Amino acid sequence: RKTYTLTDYLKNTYRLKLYSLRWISDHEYLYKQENNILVFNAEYGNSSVFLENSTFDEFGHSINDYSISPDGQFILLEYNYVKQWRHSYTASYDIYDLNKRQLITEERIPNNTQWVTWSPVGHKLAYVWNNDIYVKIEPNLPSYRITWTGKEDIIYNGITDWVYEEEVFSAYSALWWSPNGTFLAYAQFNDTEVPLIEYSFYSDESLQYPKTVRVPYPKAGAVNPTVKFFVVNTDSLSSVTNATSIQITAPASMLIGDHYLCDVTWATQERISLQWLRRIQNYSVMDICDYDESSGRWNCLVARQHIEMSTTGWVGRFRPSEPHFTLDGNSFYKIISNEEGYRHICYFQIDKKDCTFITKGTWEVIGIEALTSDYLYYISNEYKGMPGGRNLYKIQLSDYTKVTCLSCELNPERCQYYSVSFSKEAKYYQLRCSGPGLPLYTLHSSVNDKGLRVLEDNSALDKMLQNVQMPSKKLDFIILNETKFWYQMILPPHFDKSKKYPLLLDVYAGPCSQKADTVFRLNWATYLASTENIIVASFDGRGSGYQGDKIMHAINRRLGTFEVEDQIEAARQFSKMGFVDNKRIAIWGWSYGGYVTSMVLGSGSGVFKCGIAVAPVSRWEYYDSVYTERYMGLPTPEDNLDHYRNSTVMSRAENFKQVEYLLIHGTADDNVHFQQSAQISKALVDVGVDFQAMWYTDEDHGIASSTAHQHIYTHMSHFIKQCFSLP
Amino acid sequence: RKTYTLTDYLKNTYRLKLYSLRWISDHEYLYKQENNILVFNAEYGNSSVFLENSTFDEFGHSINDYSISPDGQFILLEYNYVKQWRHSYTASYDIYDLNKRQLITEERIPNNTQWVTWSPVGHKLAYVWNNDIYVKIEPNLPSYRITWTGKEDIIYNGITDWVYEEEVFSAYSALWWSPNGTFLAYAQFNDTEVPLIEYSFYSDESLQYPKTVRVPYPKAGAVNPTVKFFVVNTDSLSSVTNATSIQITAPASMLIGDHYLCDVTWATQERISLQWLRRIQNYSVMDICDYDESSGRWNCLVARQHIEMSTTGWVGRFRPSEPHFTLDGNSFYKIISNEEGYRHICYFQIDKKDCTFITKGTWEVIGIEALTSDYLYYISNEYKGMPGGRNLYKIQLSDYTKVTCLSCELNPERCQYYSVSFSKEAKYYQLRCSGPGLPLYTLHSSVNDKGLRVLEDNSALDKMLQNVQMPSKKLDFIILNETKFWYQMILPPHFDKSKKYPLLLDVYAGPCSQKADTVFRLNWATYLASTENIIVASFDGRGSGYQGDKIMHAINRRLGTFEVEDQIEAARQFSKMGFVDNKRIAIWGWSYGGYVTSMVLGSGSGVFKCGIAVAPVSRWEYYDSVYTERYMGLPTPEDNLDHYRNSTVMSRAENFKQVEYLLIHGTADDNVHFQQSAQISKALVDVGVDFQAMWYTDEDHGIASSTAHQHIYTHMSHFIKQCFSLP
Numbered sequence A, B: 001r002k003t004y005t006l007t008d009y010l011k012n013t014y015r016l017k018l019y020s021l022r023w024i025s026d027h028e029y030l031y032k033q034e035n036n037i038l039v040f041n042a043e044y045g046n047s048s049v050f051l052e053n054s055t056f057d058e059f060g061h062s063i064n065d066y067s068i069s070p071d072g073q074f075i076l077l078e079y080n081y082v083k084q085w086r087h088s089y090t091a092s093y094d095i096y097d098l099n100k101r102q103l104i105t106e107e108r109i110p111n112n113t114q115w116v117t118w119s120p121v122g123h124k125l126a127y128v129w130n131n132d133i134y135v136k137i138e139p140n141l142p143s144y145r146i147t148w149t150g151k152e153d154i155i156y157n158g159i160t161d162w163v164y165e166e167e168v169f170s171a172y173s174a175l176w177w178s179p180n181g182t183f184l185a186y187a188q189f190n191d192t193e194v195p196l197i198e199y200s201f202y203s204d205e206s207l208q209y210p211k212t213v214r215v216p217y218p219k220a221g222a223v224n225p226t227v228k229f230f231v232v233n234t235d236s237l238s239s240v241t242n243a244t245s246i247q248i249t250a251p252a253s254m255l256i257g258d259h260y261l262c263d264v265t266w267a268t269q270e271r272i273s274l275q276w277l278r279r280i281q282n283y284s285v286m287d288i289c290d291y292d293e294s295s296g297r298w299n300c301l302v303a304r305q306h307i308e309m310s311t312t313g314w315v316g317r318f319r320p321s322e323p324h325f326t327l328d329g330n331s332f333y334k335i336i337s338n339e340e341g342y343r344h345i346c347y348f349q350i351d352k353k354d355c356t357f358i359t360k361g362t363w364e365v366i367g368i369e370a371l372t373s374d375y376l377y378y379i380s381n382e383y384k385g386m387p388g389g390r391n392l393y394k395i396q397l398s399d400y401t402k403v404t405c406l407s408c409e410l411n412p413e414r415c416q417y418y419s420v421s422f423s424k425e426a427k428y429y430q431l432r433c434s435g436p437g438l439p440l441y442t443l444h445s446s447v448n449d450k451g452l453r454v455l456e457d458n459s460a461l462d463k464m465l466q467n468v469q470m471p472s473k474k475l476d477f478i479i480l481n482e483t484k485f486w487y488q489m490i491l492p493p494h495f496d497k498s499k500k501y502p503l504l505l506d507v508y509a510g511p512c513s514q515k516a517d518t519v520f521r522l523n524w525a526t527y528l529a530s531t532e533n534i535i536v537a538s539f540d541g542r543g544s545g546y547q548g549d550k551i552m553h554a555i556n557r558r559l560g561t562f563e564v565e566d567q568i569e570a571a572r573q574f575s576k577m578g579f580v581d582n583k584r585i586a587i588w589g590w591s592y593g594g595y596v597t598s599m600v601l602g603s604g605s606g607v608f609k610c611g612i613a614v615a616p617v618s619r620w621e622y623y624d625s626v627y628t629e630r631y632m633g634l635p636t637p638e639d640n641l642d643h644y645r646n647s648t649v650m651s652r653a654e655n656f657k658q659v660e661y662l663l664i665h666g667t668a669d670d671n672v673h674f675q676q677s678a679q680i681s682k683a684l685v686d687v688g689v690d691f692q693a694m695w696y697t698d699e700d701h702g703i704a705s706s707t708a709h710q711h712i713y714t715h716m717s718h719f720i721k722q723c724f725s726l727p
């Protein structure tokens, strides 16, 4: 009667094999084996030992990562890694000649380097150190210093500040090489007048006085960072005179007030597109700027400026979507919310603004994965009208009726959720099936869409799981006000619909979220279902993503309303089904899910006996501007201050009398500050409500260190088991 | 009947009734009788309404406290109270002329005044504002500024810094008037090179960004603040020239290193005594200083210098004890530990180094309360060989073998714990019996020690607690290594010895602590006994006070050792008594007790099932220098770093697998910094131990606010009840 135990989750008893490859050419890619890096050919199989783990003994330092130059001559080695935020870090760097089999000692990249990157061809290097940009034409040669204004916590050249990193670019870098690698474009960020979040960091017990960390962080309605865009020619660099960065100022549409740079895409060698976004994020502008060799400057022609605005809510999913440009750069494809509010691919001519929708229907495109002369490849949730499914498609650019699903019917029962990685000029691709069956990895040729070989099919894990009492999984929908709203249920083994099980509602419910999908996972819910016989439910109600704006923009300016009501309403529908002990219905959630969980418990519905909130938002004025304001607008009397104040967890404190609550938070959360939880604890105390609590010293929003991760789930497991009266 | 519930404690259902009086003369005292301030004739009771409960009805502000001058002409009104640390605060101040029943409104005391005080006679005013001293001769007239070097968190003129406030003077003021009010003595602290503790304060929900509080706090081994002492003549204050402050420099044996000013006591109109302590607190020095009217300076004769030291530990109980000077100022009485190791009254002549012990034996003098021409009055625990008891005594100065107890037999069954307050010339005195019966307040005449009248006897409360199933106290002792160690037990009503009971150990166990005593308390323990049938015990092991240096100095340089070991042994002893359920032995504590509870739970003794630790110290290097170093010395290689490192809670993390642990701490604890608990959790998480936790937002070391107080005792009750399997 072996089951998926808590320990199995915490101690990776049942590993899940991936197949991460790195496309180096159109024909080849790299893969890790024995710790060695092996280059493969796509068509034949043609293996060859590119690099060997034996190479880097006597190097002294442990190698965290690497990066092979485009041309193939050099490899970057990344050590002394030190994590900062979600994507940001610092690390020491060294270069290895590969062809000479020699490590380079000449003019080495500085220690504590913030970011580094090769050009897309050849072997130029750009790196950021002390918030300044440096360029190295050759590894061995001295670097050319581009920026001289870098300054910790104020001026950021070629790297992002906290809020851009987190909410805009999903990256620490703010550099963009042109394709042939001659121009390097970069953004500069200025946080002078941005207020600082302050919190304690305690460190090893040997540290006597706690450190006070100070991070520039704009909260809702605060002073935001200002941005400037620059381009510099990397060929015409002088070793004698300072480099000259040409500015590309934002368009007058943006300069009237607060705005952001949101997307940067090169079209050609002489052409670059810049999407901007007003601080009120319903209005966006894309300039298409061309280099002229006459004046040495850049020109964004007004006749190529594309405006994009939404009247129901915000622009894009989390931002304006990226443009994929054609060969000549005189036209581009780009996902746009259509007339019926469903996101689809729109074909633009650069000097004709009204695009043509090459796709349509009651479904959305997730992303444009590859563009060729004749075909555009994209991922969508079209197959079987299932919003939580993902498949690869291609549309013939010369006739839009020629839509071919390349992944729908490969293993229909085993695969309904695909992601894709193409080769450099898109001749091949790798298909990643992440569920509902065991994940499956296969390589393909884009010429005739032939299944070349299976890279990894997780048959080892399959042998192991055959013996285990695994939970099943049910994906389905309910109808509310005519609309289908989907849910998923991790059901226990030997599921008996006449019996009555306790239910845990797994919640996120943030703007454009999707918890109801066909993905295969081995997580906490697996354990709860397998060992403790708990149904783990997830529901996607109003505000959720990938089903059109009808649903998604329902919460516009109204966070802590419809998405809360629907999670409550979902649980009510789960009792109706007659296999749920309605005396043992619980809720839980991390982050936004913690806010919704908190607000749900504060609603006073009585449906939920107990709830857990991990690193929850409490009041939208405590969280950052770029995220909060995209949905809530500005917290002013003239805009939406009232709902800001009306949607706090604190104000509902009285209603936690009837529930059991567990409030968990990391003390060094730089994202959802411990502040947030501090005000929840303080409100509950003031209305005399008892509740359990837990801080995690020096843990951040992830609470992901092996020890902390194990401790929190063990604590939450205990709390749920006792709430459900289980041994 | 009904029981003493947790509601009774928290809501304060059964109040005791005090009798707080201020002796204004040799034969009169003031009493606040339902806001009407009366003045009583001590000899009879002839009382007249000194000031109406009305008077200040159209003031508009709420009066926090009041202070009437010695001459009776003026009354100081305190309002806008804003608590800082244990003693410190700021307030607004308005003066009121009693003769003319009108309010002074010119040259008023500024707002945010840090301290104010009358001269001991007349109506002069010294006050502190922005860390600078001011003097007003007349309430209406402009103040004179004394100090100009005051600077927030750097220089403190006339007021203590953090550490002196908490660890030396138990007061915010560092201002001492001469008896007639001619000279104003003042200390000055320089916290420049003293590091800062920093922590978040989140404040009202409205506050968008938390405030980092930054307090000068020297942790163990850090840079201490320096001190300088001065005197100034208030009678000769010039409004043209800035005032002259004559400095009294510390003795040379102090100036060779770090040191503290630990006592200031005026002996006569022109004579002031100082006491200095080395940073290594086993060496004190007293200088008696006389005014020289010809040069206008202060000289302390090396003839009148008195060295006070120790080989077994540290000087005095918490600091060098205060001297009570004779009228002429040519001698004084002072509590000192003797040959045997017991603290008794020694008689010093100011110009002779050796004193004579006027009392002796295996008991200790707690304090010297009065001095007349032929009798010295003192409180001690000599009666019935009970360290926990307190009684008033007098000793004939012409014959030390004639010793009369004043309070011993007044009511032996009811009263074993007295304090006293004498009239201006010890003609009358108020005796205050704190237990074991209900507290009793009586007035007496020192001429013959005649009882005059019962002032308060708590009859009202006596009638209330007849319909309440009250517990019963049991003060007793066990023997360890042939030495008696006292303990108490709060026992549930209907105490059946043949049954077995759950045991909670209330612990403090700090140096010179006393938890086993004769006082009557209506506290949390009263509810655990009366309602839940829990035996709540406390035990004064090694390190405990009022039983000699054999016991109190047993933990010198060795905190975390015996006082821990002894609480365990005490629990082993109680489990061997037949009426104690050894399956259900709990332990708890606040502060030092929290440190001890933690050390005990991580001891691996296997005696305690569960325990609660509240605002615990975790590592002595985190706690302040003045306290910690008294009992540990410096945390250095040359001194005692080895034990500083050996005596952490975190070193004992592994052993918490055997116990249910609740850790509690407030986020604005300026004293034992949240850090300390933060380091415990991290250790428990690092080794994978489960434990419950609870933080209290913006609460300090007291966790005293109405709602925070109610919530923690509520929270701790559940923890104990469920640990003991009680409904």
Ligand SMILES: *[C@@H]1O[C@H](CO)[C@@H](O[C@H]2O[C@H](CO)[C@@H](O)[C@H](O[C@H]3O[C@H](CO)[C@@H](O)[C@H](O[C@H]4O[C@H](CO)[C@@H](O)[C@H](O)[C@@H]4O)[C@@H]3O)[C@@H]2O)[C@H](O)[C@H]1NC(C)=O
Residues within 6 Å of the ligand: A149, A155, A190, A192, A193
């Ligand atoms: C990042 O952003 C910073 C502002 O957010 C910017 O710093 C400028 O702004 C600061 C405000 O923080 C200004 O103090 C300063 O400009 C002004 O400085 C003086 C005020 O203290 C003011 O007297 C100056 O005006 C004078 O001089 C100018 C010509 O230089 C004349 O126009 C005026 O008539 C007058 O004579 C001046 O206006 C800062 O420049 C940072 O520079 C920015 N960093 C970037 C973009 O890298």
Ligand SMILES: COc1cc2ccc3c(c2cc1OC)C[C@H](N)[C@@H](c1cc(F)c(F)cc1F)O3
Residues within 6 Å of the ligand: A165, A166, A167, A168, A169, A170, A318, A510, A591, A592, A616, A617, A627, A671, A672, A701
């Ligand atoms: C598609 O790209 C994105 C998806 C995203 C999905 C969730 C998402 C973000 C995303 C940011 C993205 O790009 C910058 C950023 C938020 N800080 C994050 C987030 C949201 C919260 F409400 C919260 F309390 C903490 C968080 F870390 O949620």
Ligand SMILES: COc1cc2ccc3c(c2cc1OC)C[C@H](N)[C@@H](c1cc(F)c(F)cc1F)O3
Residues within 6 Å of the ligand: B166, B167, B168, B169, B170, B317, B318, B510, B591, B592, B616, B617, B627, B671, B672, B701
């Ligand atoms: C006799 O007077 C005193 C008694 C005292 C009794 C306990 C006492 C103090 C005292 C200070 C005194 O005067 C300076 C000061 C300490 N900071 C306090 C104290 C000790 C601790 F171990 C701790 F963790 C927190 C504290 F606030 O304990």
Ligand SMILES: *[C@@H]1O[C@H](CO)[C@@H](O)[C@H](O)[C@H]1NC(C)=O
Residues within 6 Å of the ligand: A148, A240, A241, A242
């Ligand atoms: C370039 O500009 C910076 C401005 O900070 C200056 O300090 C540096 O000397 C200049 N170098 C050259 C080569 O002009």
Ligand SMILES: *[C@@H]1O[C@H](CO)[C@@H](O)[C@H](O)[C@H]1NC(C)=O
Residues within 6 Å of the ligand: B149, B155, B190, B192, B193
């Ligand atoms: C306080 O100390 C510093 C050196 O630590 C000194 O420079 C400063 O002048 C001092 N101030 C006073 C008022 O003593």
